PDB file of all heavy atoms in Angstrom:
ATOM      1  N   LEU B   4      16.873   8.665 -13.029  1.00  0.00           N
ATOM      2  CA  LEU B   4      17.537   8.408 -11.764  1.00  0.00           C
ATOM      3  C   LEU B   4      17.969   6.939 -11.668  1.00  0.00           C
ATOM      4  O   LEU B   4      17.181   6.059 -11.320  1.00  0.00           O
ATOM      5  CB  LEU B   4      16.594   8.783 -10.610  1.00  0.00           C
ATOM      6  CG  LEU B   4      15.812  10.100 -10.718  1.00  0.00           C
ATOM      7  CD1 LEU B   4      14.979  10.346  -9.464  1.00  0.00           C
ATOM      8  CD2 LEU B   4      16.718  11.292 -10.957  1.00  0.00           C
ATOM      9  N   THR B  11      13.222   6.975 -10.703  1.00  0.00           N
ATOM     10  CA  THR B  11      12.325   7.365 -11.768  1.00  0.00           C
ATOM     11  C   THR B  11      11.001   6.636 -11.580  1.00  0.00           C
ATOM     12  O   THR B  11      10.985   5.418 -11.536  1.00  0.00           O
ATOM     13  CB  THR B  11      12.938   7.072 -13.139  1.00  0.00           C
ATOM     14  OG1 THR B  11      14.079   7.919 -13.270  1.00  0.00           O
ATOM     15  CG2 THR B  11      11.975   7.334 -14.275  1.00  0.00           C
ATOM     16  N   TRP B  24      -6.857  14.758  -0.935  1.00  0.00           N
ATOM     17  CA  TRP B  24      -7.697  13.870  -0.143  1.00  0.00           C
ATOM     18  C   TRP B  24      -7.887  14.461   1.247  1.00  0.00           C
ATOM     19  O   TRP B  24      -7.006  15.146   1.765  1.00  0.00           O
ATOM     20  CB  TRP B  24      -7.023  12.508   0.032  1.00  0.00           C
ATOM     21  CG  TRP B  24      -6.747  11.778  -1.244  1.00  0.00           C
ATOM     22  CD1 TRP B  24      -5.738  12.024  -2.128  1.00  0.00           C
ATOM     23  CD2 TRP B  24      -7.499  10.682  -1.782  1.00  0.00           C
ATOM     24  NE1 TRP B  24      -5.806  11.160  -3.184  1.00  0.00           N
ATOM     25  CE2 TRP B  24      -6.860  10.305  -2.988  1.00  0.00           C
ATOM     26  CE3 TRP B  24      -8.642   9.983  -1.364  1.00  0.00           C
ATOM     27  CZ2 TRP B  24      -7.343   9.271  -3.792  1.00  0.00           C
ATOM     28  CZ3 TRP B  24      -9.107   8.950  -2.149  1.00  0.00           C
ATOM     29  CH2 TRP B  24      -8.463   8.601  -3.342  1.00  0.00           C
ATOM     30  N   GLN B  40      -3.570  -3.793   2.393  1.00  0.00           N
ATOM     31  CA  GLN B  40      -3.896  -5.168   2.045  1.00  0.00           C
ATOM     32  C   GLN B  40      -3.102  -5.615   0.819  1.00  0.00           C
ATOM     33  O   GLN B  40      -2.714  -6.773   0.739  1.00  0.00           O
ATOM     34  CB  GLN B  40      -5.413  -5.376   1.939  1.00  0.00           C
ATOM     35  CG  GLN B  40      -5.918  -5.581   0.522  1.00  0.00           C
ATOM     36  CD  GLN B  40      -7.390  -5.903   0.464  1.00  0.00           C
ATOM     37  OE1 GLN B  40      -7.924  -6.617   1.315  1.00  0.00           O
ATOM     38  NE2 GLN B  40      -8.060  -5.381  -0.557  1.00  0.00           N
ATOM     39  N   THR B  53       0.380  -8.059  10.165  1.00  0.00           N
ATOM     40  CA  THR B  53      -0.411  -6.884   9.870  1.00  0.00           C
ATOM     41  C   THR B  53       0.526  -5.790   9.349  1.00  0.00           C
ATOM     42  O   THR B  53       1.640  -5.608   9.847  1.00  0.00           O
ATOM     43  CB  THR B  53      -1.290  -6.561  11.083  1.00  0.00           C
ATOM     44  OG1 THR B  53      -1.820  -5.236  10.990  1.00  0.00           O
ATOM     45  CG2 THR B  53      -0.529  -6.731  12.375  1.00  0.00           C
ATOM     46  N   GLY B  61      12.056   4.914   5.323  1.00  0.00           N
ATOM     47  CA  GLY B  61      12.074   3.552   5.825  1.00  0.00           C
ATOM     48  C   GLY B  61      12.830   3.433   7.149  1.00  0.00           C
ATOM     49  O   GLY B  61      12.508   2.591   7.982  1.00  0.00           O
ATOM     50  N   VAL B  73      11.002  -4.793  20.000  1.00  0.00           N
ATOM     51  CA  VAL B  73      12.132  -5.236  20.802  1.00  0.00           C
ATOM     52  C   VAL B  73      11.969  -4.676  22.213  1.00  0.00           C
ATOM     53  O   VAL B  73      12.017  -3.464  22.405  1.00  0.00           O
ATOM     54  CB  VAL B  73      13.484  -4.820  20.184  1.00  0.00           C
ATOM     55  N   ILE B  83      25.971  -6.440  10.215  1.00  0.00           N
ATOM     56  CA  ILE B  83      26.397  -5.137   9.721  1.00  0.00           C
ATOM     57  C   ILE B  83      27.482  -5.276   8.650  1.00  0.00           C
ATOM     58  O   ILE B  83      28.663  -5.093   8.948  1.00  0.00           O
ATOM     59  CB  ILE B  83      26.869  -4.250  10.895  1.00  0.00           C
ATOM     60  N   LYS B  93      23.248   2.091  15.298  1.00  0.00           N
ATOM     61  CA  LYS B  93      23.065   3.419  15.854  1.00  0.00           C
ATOM     62  C   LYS B  93      21.673   3.526  16.483  1.00  0.00           C
ATOM     63  O   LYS B  93      21.504   4.255  17.461  1.00  0.00           O
ATOM     64  CB  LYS B  93      23.413   4.472  14.795  1.00  0.00           C
ATOM     65  CG  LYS B  93      23.650   5.881  15.321  1.00  0.00           C
ATOM     66  CD  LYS B  93      24.427   6.782  14.373  1.00  0.00           C
ATOM     67  CE  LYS B  93      24.159   8.258  14.596  1.00  0.00           C
ATOM     68  NZ  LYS B  93      25.294   9.115  14.178  1.00  0.00           N
ATOM     69  N   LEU B  98      18.242   3.984  21.190  1.00  0.00           N
ATOM     70  CA  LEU B  98      17.077   3.545  21.938  1.00  0.00           C
ATOM     71  C   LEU B  98      17.541   2.904  23.244  1.00  0.00           C
ATOM     72  O   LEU B  98      16.720   2.386  23.998  1.00  0.00           O
ATOM     73  CB  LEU B  98      16.278   2.556  21.081  1.00  0.00           C
ATOM     74  CG  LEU B  98      15.157   3.128  20.203  1.00  0.00           C
ATOM     75  CD1 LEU B  98      15.695   4.037  19.104  1.00  0.00           C
ATOM     76  CD2 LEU B  98      14.333   2.007  19.581  1.00  0.00           C
ATOM     77  N   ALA B 115      24.656 -17.709   7.519  1.00  0.00           N
ATOM     78  CA  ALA B 115      23.877 -18.453   8.492  1.00  0.00           C
ATOM     79  C   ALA B 115      24.795 -19.072   9.545  1.00  0.00           C
ATOM     80  O   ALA B 115      24.402 -19.233  10.703  1.00  0.00           O
ATOM     81  CB  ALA B 115      23.075 -19.507   7.773  1.00  0.00           C
ATOM     82  N   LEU B 133      18.816  -7.605  10.359  1.00  0.00           N
ATOM     83  CA  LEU B 133      19.697  -7.525   9.206  1.00  0.00           C
ATOM     84  C   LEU B 133      19.042  -6.775   8.051  1.00  0.00           C
ATOM     85  O   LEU B 133      17.824  -6.615   7.981  1.00  0.00           O
ATOM     86  CB  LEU B 133      20.056  -8.947   8.767  1.00  0.00           C
ATOM     87  CG  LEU B 133      18.969  -9.665   7.967  1.00  0.00           C
ATOM     88  CD1 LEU B 133      19.545 -10.817   7.159  1.00  0.00           C
ATOM     89  CD2 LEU B 133      17.847 -10.129   8.875  1.00  0.00           C
ATOM     90  N   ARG B 176       5.259 -17.191   5.127  1.00  0.00           N
ATOM     91  CA  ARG B 176       5.025 -18.497   5.728  1.00  0.00           C
ATOM     92  C   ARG B 176       6.258 -19.393   5.586  1.00  0.00           C
ATOM     93  O   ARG B 176       6.295 -20.500   6.128  1.00  0.00           O
ATOM     94  CB  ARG B 176       3.760 -19.152   5.166  1.00  0.00           C
ATOM     95  CG  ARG B 176       3.820 -19.491   3.685  1.00  0.00           C
ATOM     96  CD  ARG B 176       2.469 -19.269   3.023  1.00  0.00           C
ATOM     97  NE  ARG B 176       2.518 -19.462   1.577  1.00  0.00           N
ATOM     98  CZ  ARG B 176       2.274 -18.526   0.659  1.00  0.00           C
ATOM     99  NH1 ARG B 176       1.937 -17.295   1.026  1.00  0.00           N
ATOM    100  NH2 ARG B 176       2.366 -18.836  -0.626  1.00  0.00           N
ATOM    101  N   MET B 219       6.365   7.091  16.394  1.00  0.00           N
ATOM    102  CA  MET B 219       6.795   5.848  15.778  1.00  0.00           C
ATOM    103  C   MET B 219       6.293   4.609  16.519  1.00  0.00           C
ATOM    104  O   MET B 219       6.918   3.556  16.406  1.00  0.00           O
ATOM    105  CB  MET B 219       8.321   5.779  15.696  1.00  0.00           C
ATOM    106  CG  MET B 219       8.846   6.391  14.429  1.00  0.00           C
ATOM    107  SD  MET B 219      10.624   6.605  14.466  1.00  0.00           S
ATOM    108  CE  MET B 219      10.803   7.782  15.804  1.00  0.00           C
ATOM    109  N   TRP B 234      -5.338   7.333  10.404  1.00  0.00           N
ATOM    110  CA  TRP B 234      -4.004   7.608  10.893  1.00  0.00           C
ATOM    111  C   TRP B 234      -4.131   8.492  12.124  1.00  0.00           C
ATOM    112  O   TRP B 234      -5.001   9.359  12.183  1.00  0.00           O
ATOM    113  CB  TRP B 234      -3.201   8.351   9.815  1.00  0.00           C
ATOM    114  CG  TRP B 234      -3.027   7.654   8.501  1.00  0.00           C
ATOM    115  CD1 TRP B 234      -3.989   7.354   7.581  1.00  0.00           C
ATOM    116  CD2 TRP B 234      -1.779   7.225   7.932  1.00  0.00           C
ATOM    117  NE1 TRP B 234      -3.431   6.735   6.494  1.00  0.00           N
ATOM    118  CE2 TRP B 234      -2.075   6.645   6.680  1.00  0.00           C
ATOM    119  CE3 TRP B 234      -0.448   7.258   8.368  1.00  0.00           C
ATOM    120  CZ2 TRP B 234      -1.081   6.117   5.856  1.00  0.00           C
ATOM    121  CZ3 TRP B 234       0.531   6.718   7.560  1.00  0.00           C
ATOM    122  CH2 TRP B 234       0.215   6.173   6.314  1.00  0.00           C
ATOM    123  N   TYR B 266      14.090  -6.293 -13.689  1.00  0.00           N
ATOM    124  CA  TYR B 266      15.254  -5.788 -12.976  1.00  0.00           C
ATOM    125  C   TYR B 266      16.479  -6.657 -13.251  1.00  0.00           C
ATOM    126  O   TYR B 266      17.567  -6.115 -13.460  1.00  0.00           O
ATOM    127  CB  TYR B 266      15.012  -5.616 -11.472  1.00  0.00           C
ATOM    128  CG  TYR B 266      14.124  -4.463 -11.055  1.00  0.00           C
ATOM    129  CD1 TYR B 266      13.723  -4.323  -9.732  1.00  0.00           C
ATOM    130  CD2 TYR B 266      13.660  -3.531 -11.970  1.00  0.00           C
ATOM    131  CE1 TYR B 266      12.909  -3.282  -9.318  1.00  0.00           C
ATOM    132  CE2 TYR B 266      12.835  -2.489 -11.576  1.00  0.00           C
ATOM    133  CZ  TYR B 266      12.460  -2.362 -10.248  1.00  0.00           C
ATOM    134  OH  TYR B 266      11.658  -1.336  -9.853  1.00  0.00           O
ATOM    135  N   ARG B 283      34.793  -3.026 -14.104  1.00  0.00           N
ATOM    136  CA  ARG B 283      34.672  -4.185 -13.243  1.00  0.00           C
ATOM    137  C   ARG B 283      33.628  -3.902 -12.169  1.00  0.00           C
ATOM    138  O   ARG B 283      33.692  -2.871 -11.500  1.00  0.00           O
ATOM    139  CB  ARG B 283      35.999  -4.436 -12.535  1.00  0.00           C
ATOM    140  CG  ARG B 283      37.132  -4.837 -13.465  1.00  0.00           C
ATOM    141  CD  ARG B 283      38.338  -5.063 -12.578  1.00  0.00           C
ATOM    142  NE  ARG B 283      38.045  -6.076 -11.569  1.00  0.00           N
ATOM    143  CZ  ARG B 283      38.428  -7.346 -11.651  1.00  0.00           C
ATOM    144  NH1 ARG B 283      39.130  -7.765 -12.688  1.00  0.00           N
ATOM    145  NH2 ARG B 283      38.124  -8.194 -10.690  1.00  0.00           N
ATOM    146  N   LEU B 286      31.219  -6.855  -7.123  1.00  0.00           N
ATOM    147  CA  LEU B 286      30.714  -8.167  -6.747  1.00  0.00           C
ATOM    148  C   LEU B 286      30.685  -9.053  -7.993  1.00  0.00           C
ATOM    149  O   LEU B 286      30.368  -8.569  -9.080  1.00  0.00           O
ATOM    150  CB  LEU B 286      29.307  -8.001  -6.159  1.00  0.00           C
ATOM    151  CG  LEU B 286      29.165  -7.388  -4.760  1.00  0.00           C
ATOM    152  CD1 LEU B 286      29.881  -6.056  -4.624  1.00  0.00           C
ATOM    153  CD2 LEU B 286      27.693  -7.198  -4.407  1.00  0.00           C
ATOM    154  N   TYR B 323      25.114   7.357  -9.010  1.00  0.00           N
ATOM    155  CA  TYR B 323      25.201   7.401  -7.561  1.00  0.00           C
ATOM    156  C   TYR B 323      26.652   7.313  -7.101  1.00  0.00           C
ATOM    157  O   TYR B 323      27.411   6.520  -7.629  1.00  0.00           O
ATOM    158  CB  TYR B 323      24.429   6.232  -6.942  1.00  0.00           C
ATOM    159  CG  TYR B 323      23.687   6.598  -5.682  1.00  0.00           C
ATOM    160  CD1 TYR B 323      22.984   7.794  -5.584  1.00  0.00           C
ATOM    161  CD2 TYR B 323      23.651   5.735  -4.604  1.00  0.00           C
ATOM    162  CE1 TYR B 323      22.284   8.132  -4.436  1.00  0.00           C
ATOM    163  CE2 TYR B 323      22.961   6.060  -3.445  1.00  0.00           C
ATOM    164  CZ  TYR B 323      22.272   7.258  -3.363  1.00  0.00           C
ATOM    165  OH  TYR B 323      21.597   7.562  -2.218  1.00  0.00           O
ATOM    166  N   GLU B 355      30.519   8.096 -23.290  1.00  0.00           N
ATOM    167  CA  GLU B 355      30.722   9.393 -23.907  1.00  0.00           C
ATOM    168  C   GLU B 355      31.311  10.349 -22.882  1.00  0.00           C
ATOM    169  O   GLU B 355      32.295  11.045 -23.175  1.00  0.00           O
ATOM    170  CB  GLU B 355      29.416   9.947 -24.478  1.00  0.00           C
ATOM    171  CG  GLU B 355      29.571  11.301 -25.157  1.00  0.00           C
ATOM    172  CD  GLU B 355      28.310  11.794 -25.845  1.00  0.00           C
ATOM    173  OE1 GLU B 355      28.041  11.323 -26.966  1.00  0.00           O
ATOM    174  OE2 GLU B 355      27.592  12.642 -25.249  1.00  0.00           O
TER     175      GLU B 355
END
Side-chain angles (χ1 to χ4, degrees), chain B residues 4 11 24 40 53 61 93 98 115 133 176 219 234 266 283 286 323 355:
Chain B
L4 316 183
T11 295
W24 300 77
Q40 109 175 323
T53 165
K93 196 161 155 153
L98 268 66
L133 78 160
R176 65 216 175 243
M219 271 169 296
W234 301 67
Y266 287 172
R283 294 181 57 100
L286 287 53
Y323 218 42
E355 181 174 280

